Design a protein around this ligand. Structure first.
Ligand SMILES: C[C@H]1CN(C2COC2)CCN1c1ccc(Nc2cc(-c3ccnc(N4CCn5c(cc6c5CC(C)(C)C6)C4=O)c3CO)cn(C)c2=O)nc1
Length: 271
């Protein structure tokens, strides 16, 4: 109605029901939109976000829609804190989900998780849109066990120098290729590198990559050519796929379309 653009949600349409934790921009809640529709609501802590830039980008991100991508519904920007309204993912972050050993996932289910992400990433790749912080912590799981990509592109609007700096405490060092760590060379191929690390997280049930190294040691390791090695639950074929993401030469890494076709092939061979 009057006052709200297509990207704007009226916050009075929201019912807040449960706390979902805190992320880089503060508290996230579960609620209803117009008494009926499940939504998640980010409440953007003041000082944490480049808000005007985000809001202009939210207009573009409104047009991104894929079954494996957490849907943006709108923003509430007429007062602070601003809100980001999205699809709700009842089983929460993928990292915590993997770490709950009770699930006792079969390897076919782990491969489906990788496929879910790869499909989202191929979509984003098709739209020339970088994630920049692909990792299990930043994927979400719905009530049907479907994994979706979330918080894509939002790294650009983070104001926290500990996150943004390549030597900061919060920078995703362990998900970064050598050219990111050396030169800030971000590209589709740095998302590819990160996706390989994410496959490793999935097959490792959420172990920390390079768990016995610091970030500093990890940067040196990967710059010398050393890599993660095969998780116990990963077949040789699966390990070949994740490893292919880690070629020193970015231009020798696959695309998400090639990864997707490789994952489907392995599904046909191994299930
Ligand atoms: C599983 C149950 C269990 N329950 C126990 C049992 O009773 C108590 C606890 C709650 N829990 C639960 C259920 C569902 C959800 N769902 C959702 C969580 C989130 C969520 C929450 C907190 N932080 C974040 N992050 C984390 C990532 N990130 C954020 C902002 C940014 C990032 C990355 C960045 C740095 C680029 C920018 C950011 O906001 C997110 C993901 O966007 C988002 N969405 C859309 C959800 O649907 N979460 C938790």
């Amino acid at each position: 109605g009057l006052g709200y653009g297509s990207w704007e949600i009226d916050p009075k349409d929201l019912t807040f029901l449960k706390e979902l934790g805190t992320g880089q921009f503060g508290v996230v809640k579960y609620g209803k939109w117009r008494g009926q529709y499940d939504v998640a609501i980010k409440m953007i802590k003041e000082g944490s976000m480049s808000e005007d830039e985000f809001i202009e980008e939210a207009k573009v991100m409104m047009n991104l829609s894929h079954e494996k991508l957490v849907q943006l519904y709108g923003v509430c920007t007429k007062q602070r804190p601003i809100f980001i309204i999205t699809e709700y993912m009842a089983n929460g972050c993928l990292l915590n989900y993997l770490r709950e050993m009770r699930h006792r996932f079969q390897t076919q289910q782990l491969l489906e998780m990788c496929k879910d992400v790869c499909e989202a990433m191929e979509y984003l790749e098709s739209k020339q849109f970088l994630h920049r912080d692909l990792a299990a912590r930043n994927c979400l799981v719905n009530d049907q066990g479907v994994v979706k990509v979330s918080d894509f592109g939002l790294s650009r609007y983070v104001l926290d120098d500990e996150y943004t700096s390549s030597v900061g405490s919060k920078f995703p060092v362990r998900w970064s290729p050598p050219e990111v760590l050396m030169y800030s060379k971000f590209s589709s191929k740095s998302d590819i590198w990160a996706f390989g690390v994410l496959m490793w997280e999935i097959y490792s049930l959420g172990k920390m990559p390079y768990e016995r190294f610091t970030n500093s040691e990890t940067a040196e390791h990967i710059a010398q050519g050393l890599r993660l090695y095969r998780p116990h639950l990963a077949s040789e074929k699966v390990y070949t796929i994740m490893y292919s993401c880690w070629h020193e030469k970015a231009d020798e890494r696959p695309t998400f379309k090639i990864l997707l076709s490789n994952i489907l092939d392995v599904m046909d061979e191994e299930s």
